[PDB]
């Protein structure tokens, strides 16, 4: 690797492939690997690097997690010296992410299972045209640790669109380590939805099309502004690295931005990803109560990356980064165009017309050039499009847009006029009903504000009314800023009154005096609607508040824990901060969660129409002025012609 | 005029000056137009007309507000006959909008002024280099009924950026009526800040600049999608009218869009514009208890619109619609390029990759075309981005950036070390406060969904907790829809508990039994931050509820009244609302309030970033499926070469 954040090679999945069969002959041992990454090198070396490439070095350390002969191991590799360093049995609550492999062993089963077999008959159905699915589960209560999974199932006849054309009424549990189907119960039979129009590919559509849709052509006569060195991005004002983890997906790294005034390069984001996922479903019933999913968890978001693409993913003019992932037996799998890096045209960067001065027209309006880093990740029938956008003016714009299919639970209802009672969801068609749930996503922000020893301001906004009638107004609003002292004082509940949260370098400041800054300006806040000691809840625990701030600890990384299939709660960020510590001037990182309420309706049928979210990470005194004061607009060049 | 609402014409100006000048002779009349504006006709005929052109006939009328021989008079012309229809003094309280003409005498008063040429000279200014401004200044309760104005001055030498060189501790009062300066006070002697790096002009500027930002060019082979009949749009599957009003700007009405599966027009919204705004300051002191601007109330939205300026304001590809505007005189005033309309592209219409298919590989992504009608409006230090969204898939986002000069404080304080009260604001610049303030735009949409009977649903998500063990899971959300029967029931505070809003049409179901309806899917929501009963916050009372839902009244239309300057808040929608009307089932209107709560930052200055806000109203249940289900994606014509 060029850079020790590097994604791995496919020549380092191979090595690790060979050092760990070397230890687990295959002819003798049942080996599968369920995650290989980076093993975070410590944030002073990195640093110290940065500043000194040439002079420092480090080694390329790969944490592994492998079931061996039914028993979680967590192996440490030092590639330098090509050795295993360290090896240990994985003995408290929760499984790995699953893996793809086992997966498609998995939903076999019930094809040649006899009772499911007759079921189908029972019901009509054609088995040559059924495909089935593995839901985790999660956990309940019990006492029993063991790796079960719901498979659900679907037919396929006439469309590809197979999520809505649920099998309903039968629950299947499989033990993914038999491989076996261990649980069998026909409850209900409901109509299966027909295949009319959920068809969503062009090659299988017909007309009518419409409405038209004008072409375009463009063209950047020097290219683009990026440049893409190995994993490193220098752009504009900016560089970043980006990265690549199979469980986490996209990594944003070292996010500095050159102050022109100051001359000097500052340091802004040290690491930012998505951490976790929740979409907890809200049907209470035997059918859908254990569907929870925890995403990249149970599934791993870089696992379920796809390739994008080109020119409908990512526009015409965007660069593609391809990554690597691994199978269930190591091996190293091409992931193409996994990821774009492309330039946004058009927006106004600032502008005013002055028509104060007699005899005076002054006027300027200026244009900015962003940069978006994209990525998108499917899991199942969720399509989640994740971009990470850069601003010239130091704004940083993590977005999410959500695609996709609505899962369908199957009924006998054709009309609304049927309903006797709560469905759980929307009837979306006839006898379909888009179950209602929440999509939750948990950004982990580790802002290193021109250094790592900073501190979390929270600003509020009050009303003061003037009682001494010493002013013909009677109120104004003014602001009060308390610094967080500890992990408990920085558990905000967004929506609870005015205020802003802004991270700041206590110890540098700007001519005036003011601390220099970065504050997040959040979307409308979702907040949970499960009870807090429901199960789910407790194992997602981490998205009852809308933000956090923690101490750093290179350990604490996956917010619903380290291992998430089954788990039972115990190692969340909500379990971490019980701590409470100290978080005033030290290394501390913040953690954001975005959600959604998901009240399905036509429109989203068969396939939905993006909805997206966004918030922005907005320089607050961190520039001695508008850092975009002297930019110039990019220049209009003519279209050539034919 | 191609439509009966259609913005008024230069020879329809000039006609309406004629007709009042026929009877008030200006040889003995004082004369001066506040207001010229369309009379809007009724709907019924409007709806008629749409269906039958060339068959239905409305006059057009026209509503003029003048001030003669300082009277208000309130006049109406039919110009069909070419008459006045009626003419009546207003005797309550407020008056019209300012006009740009008085403001520019008023200016000139404190230059010729004894007083206020001695302030100068004790504080060492330069007379010739200073410029003033005249600010409304609303009421606090007194008795007196007069047209006076606050006035300030700036110091404008080496600078065109007078707003942040400020001559602070002077009152200067002026009445526009006698045009003379009432009340005089010399209060406070404070530095002026520097005029050193406050300039924003390129031309002005020196090196050195950057980040360089690479250009483009682009092309419609086929030439825009949109065709623009008169003020009439024509847009993939969308069609509606661009009006302009001297007060409100643009106005949007008459959006209709094709149902390829009904094939049918289906009509979503008769009319929507801003119907006021409100920047109260928070600075209870002398220098700014006051300053509270109504800008569409007293300075005129239409009035402040500015010239746009091409490739900057408006990517290259946007066609341009010029309007009039009026003196103080009447005569009408030609406003090249106010309004532009423009396709946006890139974006992912919706998508799909599917993995779930053993030994298939499946995958579909469509992108969208948009269409942008943008309009910016400058008032003073502000400047206003006013975008309308149309989307192909029948979203409409409507959204508003800010951008423009901060207004400061002069002050003796140079470092936050000195400061040792409340100062109001933030120190942003050595001598120079940015005094904190909000700012609220109130939107009226008069929707129709599918036609004028329409009710309000609120939807809110409710926690139900399983007690009675008949499941595994404690817990689960679920829906509980409410016809809202009265205008009481429709105040809605953003903010309180989850919940969908929806506008539906009670009458019209989709085949599977749902009332077709739109939502509103709101931004993070600002509230007010000032007393009830402050008295700017009474006049300001629309500002109350972020969602408020009214009968329709053809003479409800500027929530702060008609009369907004020196109003004393008889006449706002919160006053109106008091009747409280049924909604169920008739014609209704909302009123969306968005608001910025703005905590001014050393970025903001001497110029500002632009800051962005947006909402979206979404069909819900409003089509059968998917509507963009058979869209397909703009054909990615390659570049030519030079
Ligand atoms: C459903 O199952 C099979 C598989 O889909 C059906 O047959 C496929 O068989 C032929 C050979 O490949 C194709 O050319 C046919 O067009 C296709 N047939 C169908 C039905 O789609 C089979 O006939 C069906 N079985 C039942 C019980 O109807
Ligand atoms: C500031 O006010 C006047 C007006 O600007 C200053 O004089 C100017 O006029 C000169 C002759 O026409 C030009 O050559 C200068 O460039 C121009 N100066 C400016 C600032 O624009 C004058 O110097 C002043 N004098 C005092 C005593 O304050
Ligand atoms: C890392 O481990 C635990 C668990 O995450 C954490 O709470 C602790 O403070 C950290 N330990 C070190 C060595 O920093
Ligand atoms: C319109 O005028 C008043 C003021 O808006 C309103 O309250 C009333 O009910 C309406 N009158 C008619 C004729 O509908
Ligand atoms: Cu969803
Ligand atoms: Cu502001
Ligand atoms: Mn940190
Ligand atoms: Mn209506």
Redesign the interface.
């Given at each position: 690797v060029q850079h020790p954040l590097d994604p791995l090679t496919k020549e380092e999945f191979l090595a690790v492939q060979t050092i760990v069969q070397n230890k687990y002959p295959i002819s003798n041992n049942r080996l599968a690997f369920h995650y290989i990454g980076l093993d975070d090198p410590e944030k002073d070396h990195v640093l110290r690097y940065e500043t000194h490439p040439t002079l420092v070095s480090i080694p390329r350390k790969i944490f592994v997690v492998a079931i061996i002969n039914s028993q979680t191991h967590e192996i440490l590799i030092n590639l330098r010296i090509r050795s295993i360093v360290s090896d240990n049995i994985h003995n408290g609550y929760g499984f790995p992410i699953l893996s793809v492999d086992e997966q498609?062993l998995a939903?076999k089963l019930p094809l040649k299972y006899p009772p499911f077999i007759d079921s189908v008959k029972k019901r009509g159905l054609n088995l040559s045209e059924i495909?089935c699915?593995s839901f985790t589960m999660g956990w309940?209560?019990e006492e029993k640790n063991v790796r079960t999974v719901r498979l659900d199932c679907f037919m396929?006849e006439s469309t590809?669109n197979?999520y809505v054309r649920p099998i309903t009424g039968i629950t299947i549990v499989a033990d993914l380590d038999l491989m076996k189907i261990v649980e069998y119960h026909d409850r209900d039979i409901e109509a299966v939805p027909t295949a009319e129009?959920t068809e969503?590919?062009?090659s299988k559509?017909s007309p009518?099309?419409?409405?038209?849709?004008?072409?375009?052509?463009?063209?950047?006569?020097?290219?683009?502004?990026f440049q893409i060195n190995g994993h490193s991005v220098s752009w504009?004002?900016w560089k970043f690295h980006i990265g690549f983890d199979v469980r986490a997906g996209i990594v944003i790294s070292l996010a500095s931005i050159?102050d022109?005034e100051k001359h000097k390069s500052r340091r802004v984001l040290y690491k930012g990803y998505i951490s976790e996922l929740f979409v907890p479903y809200?049907?209470?019933?035997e059918e859908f109560?254990?569907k929870t999913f925890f995403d990249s968890g149970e599934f791993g978001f870089g696992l379920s990356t796809?390739?994008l693409?080109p020119?409908?993913?990512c526009?015409?003019h965007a660069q593609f980064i391809d990554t690597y992932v691994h199978s269930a037996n190591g091996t190293p799998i091409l992931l193409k165009n996994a990821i774009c890096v492309f330039?946004?045209?058009?927006?106004?960067?600032?502008?005013?017309?002055?028509?104060?001065?007699?005899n005076?027209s002054?006027?300027?309006?200026?244009?900015?050039?962003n940069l978006i880093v994209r990525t998108?990740v499917?899991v199942?029938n969720y399509?989640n499009?994740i971009d990470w956008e850069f601003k010239?003016?130091?704004?940083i714009k993590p977005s999410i847009?959500l695609?996709?299919?609505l899962e369908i639970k199957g009924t006998n209802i054709?009309?609304?006029?049927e309903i006797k009672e709560?469905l759980?969801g929307?009837?979306?068609?006839?006898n379909s009903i888009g179950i209602?749930h929440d999509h939750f996503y948990i950004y982990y922000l580790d802002f290193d504000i021109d250094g790592t020893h900073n501190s979390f301001e929270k600003?509020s906004?009050?009303?003061?009314?003037?009682k001494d009638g010493?002013?013909?107004?009677?109120?104004?609003?003014?602001?009060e800023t308390q610094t967080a002292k500890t992990e408990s004082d920085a558990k905000i509940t967004?929506?609870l009154a005015?205020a802003?949260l802004v991270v700041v370098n206590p110890n540098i400041?700007?001519?005036?005096?003011?601390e220099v800054g970065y504050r997040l300006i959040?979307?409308?806040?979702?907040?949970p609607?499960?009870?807090e000691?429901?199960?789910?809840?407790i194992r997602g625990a981490f998205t009852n508040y809308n933000v956090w701030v923690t101490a750093y600890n290179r350990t604490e990384k996956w917010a619903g824990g380290l291992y998430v299939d089954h788990s039972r709660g115990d190692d969340t960020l909500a379990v971490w901060t019980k701590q409470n510590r100290e978080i005033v001037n030290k290394d501390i990182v913040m953690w954001h969660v975005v959600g959604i309420?998901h009240?399905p309706?036509?429109?989203?049928?068969?396939?939905?129409?993006?909805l997206s979210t966004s918030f922005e990470l907005?320089?607050?005194?961190?520039?001695?002025?508008?850092?975009?004061?002297?930019?110039?607009?990019?220049?209009?060049?003519?279209?050539?012609?034919?």
């Open positions: 498609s939903i495909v699915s309940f209560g396929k590809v197979i129009n969503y590919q062009v559509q009518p099309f419409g409405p038209k849709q004008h072409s375009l052509t463009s063209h950047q006569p020097q290219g683009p502004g504009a004002n050159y022109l809200q049907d209470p019933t109560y254990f796809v390739s693409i020119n409908r993913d526009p015409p330039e946004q045209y058009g927006n106004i960067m600032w502008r005013h017309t002055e028509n104060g001065i007699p005076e002054i006027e300027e309006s200026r244009t900015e050039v998108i499917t199942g399509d499009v010239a003016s130091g704004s847009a695609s996709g299919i054709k009309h609304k006029d709560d759980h929307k009837l979306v068609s006839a209602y600003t906004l009050k009303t003061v009314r003037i010493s002013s013909k107004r009677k109120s104004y609003w003014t602001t967004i929506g005015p802003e400041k700007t001519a005036v005096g003011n959040p979307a409308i806040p979702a907040h609607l499960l009870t000691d429901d199960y789910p809840q309420h009240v309706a036509q429109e989203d049928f068969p396939i939905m129409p993006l907005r320089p607050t005194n961190f520039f001695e002025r508008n850092p975009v004061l002297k930019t110039l607009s990019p220049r209009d060049v003519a279209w050539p012609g034919c």
